Amino acid sequence: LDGNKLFNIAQRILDTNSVLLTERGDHIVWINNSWKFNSEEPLITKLILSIRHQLPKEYSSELLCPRKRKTVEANIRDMLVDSVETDTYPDKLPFKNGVLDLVDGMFYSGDDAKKYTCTVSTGFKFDDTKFVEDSPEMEELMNIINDIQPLTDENKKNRELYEKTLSSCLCGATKGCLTFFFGETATGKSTTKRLLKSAIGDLFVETGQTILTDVLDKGPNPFIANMHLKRSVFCSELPDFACSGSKKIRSDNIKKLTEPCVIGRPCFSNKINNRNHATIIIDTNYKPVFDRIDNALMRRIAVVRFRTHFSQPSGREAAENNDAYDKVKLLDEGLDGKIQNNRYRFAFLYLLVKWYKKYHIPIMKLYPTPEEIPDFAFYLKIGTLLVSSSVKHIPLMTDLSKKGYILYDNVVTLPLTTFQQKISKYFNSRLFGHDIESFINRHKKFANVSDEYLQYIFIEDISSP
Amino acid sequence: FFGETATGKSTTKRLLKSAIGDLFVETGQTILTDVLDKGPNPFIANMHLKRSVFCSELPDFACSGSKKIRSDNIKKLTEPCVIGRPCFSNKINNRNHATIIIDTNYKPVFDRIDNALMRRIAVVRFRTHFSQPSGREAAENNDAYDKVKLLDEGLDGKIQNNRYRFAFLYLLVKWYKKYHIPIMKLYPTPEEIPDFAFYLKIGTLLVSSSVKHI
Amino acid sequence: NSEEPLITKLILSIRHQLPKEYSSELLCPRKRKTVEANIRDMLVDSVETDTYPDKLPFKNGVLDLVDGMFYS
Amino acid sequence: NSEEPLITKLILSIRHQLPKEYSSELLCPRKRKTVEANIRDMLVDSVETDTYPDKLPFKNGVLDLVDGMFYS
DNA sequence: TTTTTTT
Ligand SMILES: Nc1ncnc2c1ncn2[C@@H]1O[C@H](COP(=O)(O)OP(=O)(O)OP(=O)(O)O)[C@@H](O)[C@H]1O
Numbered sequence: 001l002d003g004n005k006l007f008n009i010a011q012r013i014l015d016t017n018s019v020l021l022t023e024r025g026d027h028i029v030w031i032n033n034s035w036k037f038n039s040e041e042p043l044i045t046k047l048i049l050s051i052r053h054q055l056p057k058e059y060s061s062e063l064l065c066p067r068k069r070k071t072v073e074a075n076i077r078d079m080l081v082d083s084v085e086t087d088t089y090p091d092k093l094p095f096k097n098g099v100l101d102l103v104d105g106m107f108y109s110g111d112d113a114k115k116y117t118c119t120v121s122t123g124f125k126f127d128d129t130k131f132v133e134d135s136p137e138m139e140e141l142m143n144i145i146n147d148i149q150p151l152t153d154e155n156k157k158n159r160e161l162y163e164k165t166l167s168s169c170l171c172g173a174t175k176g177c178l179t180f181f182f183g184e185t186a187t188g189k190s191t192t193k194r195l196l197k198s199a200i201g202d203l204f205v206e207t208g209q210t211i212l213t214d215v216l217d218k219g220p221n222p223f224i225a226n227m228h229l230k231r232s233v234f235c236s237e238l239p240d241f242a243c244s245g246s247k248k249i250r251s252d253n254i255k256k257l258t259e260p261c262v263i264g265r266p267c268f269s270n271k272i273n274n275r276n277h278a279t280i281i282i283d284t285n286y287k288p289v290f291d292r293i294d295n296a297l298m299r300r301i302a303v304v305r306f307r308t309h310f311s312q313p314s315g316r317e318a319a320e321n322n323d324a325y326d327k328v329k330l331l332d333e334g335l336d337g338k339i340q341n342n343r344y345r346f347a348f349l350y351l352l353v354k355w356y357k358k359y360h361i362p363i364m365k366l367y368p369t370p371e372e373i374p375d376f377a378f379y380l381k382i383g384t385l386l387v388s389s390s391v392k393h394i395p396l397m398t399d400l401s402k403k404g405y406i407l408y409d410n411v412v413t414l415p416l417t418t419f420q421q422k423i424s425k426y427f428n429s430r431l432f433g434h435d436i437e438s439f440i441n442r443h444k445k446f447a448n449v450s451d452e453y454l455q456y457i458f459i460e461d462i463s464s465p
Numbered sequence: 466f467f468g469e470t471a472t473g474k475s476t477t478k479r480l481l482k483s484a485i486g487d488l489f490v491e492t493g494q495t496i497l498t499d500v501l502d503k504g505p506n507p508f509i510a511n512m513h514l515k516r517s518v519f520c521s522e523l524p525d526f527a528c529s530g531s532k533k534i535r536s537d538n539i540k541k542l543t544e545p546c547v548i549g550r551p552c553f554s555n556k557i558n559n560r561n562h563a564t565i566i567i568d569t570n571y572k573p574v575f576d577r578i579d580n581a582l583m584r585r586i587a588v589v590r591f592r593t594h595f596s597q598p599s600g601r602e603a604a605e606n607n608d609a610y611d612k613v614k615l616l617d618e619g620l621d622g623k624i625q626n627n628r629y630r631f632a633f634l635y636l637l638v639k640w641y642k643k644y645h646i647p648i649m650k651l652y653p654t655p656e657e658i659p660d661f662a663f664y665l666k667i668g669t670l671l672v673s674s675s676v677k678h679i
Numbered sequence: 680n681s682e683e684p685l686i687t688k689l690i691l692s693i694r695h696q697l698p699k700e701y702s703s704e705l706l707c708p709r710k711r712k713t714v715e716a717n718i719r720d721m722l723v724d725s726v727e728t729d730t731y732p733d734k735l736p737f738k739n740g741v742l743d744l745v746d747g748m749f750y751s
Numbered sequence: 752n753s754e755e756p757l758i759t760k761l762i763l764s765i766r767h768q769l770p771k772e773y774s775s776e777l778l779c780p781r782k783r784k785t786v787e788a789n790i791r792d793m794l795v796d797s798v799e800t801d802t803y804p805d806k807l808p809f810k811n812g813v814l815d816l817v818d819g820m821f822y823s
Numbered sequence: 824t825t826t827t828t829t830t
């Protein structure tokens with residue numbers, strides 16, 4: 001009782017678990033030791049033609065006809081009901097010919113790599129011979145790395161963060177901070193960007209500046225769409241906001257960028273949600289300024305500093321006189337060509353995985369460093385210098401009461417000029433007049449029609465000198 | 466390309482176009498002042514795999530409403546990859562292989578000037594005028610020129626008919642053999658631009674503190 | 680859904696409940712398309728959906744928020 | 752071309768290289784479409800292009816700028 | 824803000 005032959009062929013193909021359906025509406029196939037999906041080519045027919053050697057002899061002859069292949073594809077589409085979830089392992093690095101385990105280090109190939117439904121890859125094959133610590137390329141690469149970010153007591157704290165942020169690019173989780181590479185010209189940050197791109201293949205992606213300026217929901221926005229399921233997104237050439245007419249990056253969008261999902265749609269599609277598995281790195285020479293500064297913004301900022309100059313001999317003199325640098329080196333003419341030739345593709349992957357094994361093994365999280373945030377520093381200082389009144393200050397109010405304070409309904413009354421003079425004794429009120437005014441009308445409280453008071457008691461008001 | 470009118474800018478442009486065929490491209494002014502993310506931009510999407518891009522007729526900036534050259538656009542225009550989406554497509558990456566040449570009669574001015582901008586600027590001057598016999602006399606008393614010659618009537622037709630298509634190609638090949646054999650690189654000329662002349666001296670007559678000078 | 684042909688999937692799925700002489704006819708895609716066309720032609724009236732506000736849907740059934748037991 | 756199937760033109764042009772038994776089969780456009788479908792099915796893996804910066808491409812050949820030799 | 828995407 002042998003029925004349709006093409007149905008049997010389709011059933012046997014489906015039994016190998018080589019075609020799967022995702023919740024996004026796409027079909028993924030397992031061909032050439034990788035998971036590939038696309039909406040414009042017949043991948044199912046390619047798989048049917050490719051796997052014809054695993055079937056009995058009486059079945060392989062039927063797959064040469066394209067119409068029979070189309071019939072088998074239609075059957076397979078009919079029998080595929082039930083979606084599956086993909087990209088759920090954050091500690092696995094997919095390649096073209098297998099998946100590398102970042103936890104311990106062995107490389108999986110073939111069926112062993114099938115269980116990890118990694119729908120993306122690095123786009124190139126993995127080679128074991130070049131993945132070794134002792135190679136002529138390693139010493140050359142270490143010299144460049146030490147030149148860009150020298151290791152020393154002065155730079156010991158910044159280099160650790162610089163390597164930790166680069167190492168974080170290997171994970172497939174969501175990151176809660178953004179990276180700003182602040183440096184002058186010829187500081188080697190572009191070389192680092194190119195090295196990272198060559199190391200991580202097409203997982204690296206570059207998008208326009210508009211993902212920080214406009215509204216992400218203003219019609220189609222392929223720039224956000226291309227970010228989907230990436231692990232590193234680079235934005236470049238921040239415009240200078242000091243000059244008039246420049247548009248200051250909104251604080252709203254950076255908070256959205258730290259959410260596990262982003263709202264945006266591509267062309268010829270209606271899907272909105274996109275997985276945010278990537279880290280944001282933006283390189284610039286000017287420190288950015290935000291329209292509004294809030295307490296939520298200091299949990300989502302991180303800055304790396306570049307303080308090395310690679311100058312030609314003709315500019316040897318002036319580079320020494322400039323105070324923004326700390327070391328001057330001779331520019332390498334042929335370095336760019338070697339970088340473009342993927343000369344350090346695996347020597348940098350070894351460094352990346354070695355760094356990953358150092359920091360990111362137990363948990364992935366960063367420690368904020370508010371000790372060096374000059375642009376927000378004053379906003380911190382008041383927060384660390386003002387103590388509000390409470391119940392414990394009620395018994396001691398009388399001593400403060402003789403110092404110009406009136407106990408009206410158990411509320412401390414603070415004259416305006418007293419706080420004006422106290423803050424103007426060190427801060428030039430002319431420079432931050434607008435900022436102080438904004439803080440005031442955001443924090444002003446009306447005791448009555450005329451008198452205005454502040455709900456804080458200065459430490460020096462109660463502590464004897 | 467800096468020079469007055471009737472100095473051979475368009476003749477050189479057409480000679481290069483006839484020499485290099487489809488590898489030459491002509492693009493609008495929007496790539497220098499207009500934002501590259503304001504929807505689709507086919508002007509920069511047409512630069513894919515091109516080897517020479519020309520833009521001509523820079524307007525004077527003294528006119529009201531004139532937009533000056535953005536420094537950030539210049540900085541991001543020299544990158545190996547340029548971001549731009551042509552119409553009816555989703556691709557946003559274009560490969561940059563072309564030399565950008567701007568033809569103008571006035572010295573350009575930028576909104577912001579910094580050490581980054583001084584590294585990507587070169588200027589070449591045209592100092593020869595071809596004049597008709599009627600108005601040639603008024604050309605010997607002008608400092609903008611150093612030699613006055615007679616206009617050739619039929620040169621444009623010869624240039625159009627691709628008469629010198631291969632001679633120019635041979636000359637270009639000889640020049641490439643002369644210069645770009647070991648390493649190909651273009652070097653900037655900060656001095657020519659007038660507005661930079663301030664900053665160039667700033668790093669010369671000022672020095673920082675020294676341990677011996679403390 | 681408006682993209683994949685769920686009708687053909689249903690036709691292929693429920694082929695076991697049909698008599699023995701009808702199951703073998705559903706293994707060909709063209710017959711499935713003809714059956715789908717007939718079904719689409721035979722459907723005229725419409726029905727309103729989601730009329731019960733106190734029911735929580737799942738895959739293995741619907742949970743009732745009044746009593747607390749789970750249908751399946 | 753992003754909108755024209757040049758594969759059919761290539762199939763028609765490459766006819767003379769094949770033996771005479773297969774030569775007459777390519778005159779029918781439907782056979783050419785079938786061959787194009789087969790070729791598109793067996794074509795997996797992408798190849799990068801334009802990796803040589805010192806070569807000048809022409810319509811009937813490529814010129815080498817290193818030594819001036821012309822290849823066709 | 825009319826184009827763009829939509830057809
Ligand atoms: N260790 C090194 N030794 C010598 N030359 C180096 C070294 N690292 C980089 N260089 C060279 O010095 C230059 C570094 O400048 P780069 O192109 O990185 O620009 P940048 O100012 O750092 O950044 P961007 O252009 O992205 O703003 C390049 O020409 C590079 O080839």
Ligand SMILES: Nc1ncnc2c1ncn2[C@@H]1O[C@H](COP(=O)(O)OP(=O)(O)OP(=O)(O)O)[C@@H](O)[C@H]1O
Pocket residue numbers: 468469470471472473474475476477568595614615616617618619620621
């Ligand atoms: N030896 C020569 N070299 C170049 N052009 C010549 C020469 N002899 C005569 N001419 C003529 O001189 C003219 C070249 O200048 P033309 O008036 O065309 O200005 P242009 O190149 O468009 O310059 P600009 O854009 O600065 O105005 C052409 O008409 C050309 O035929």
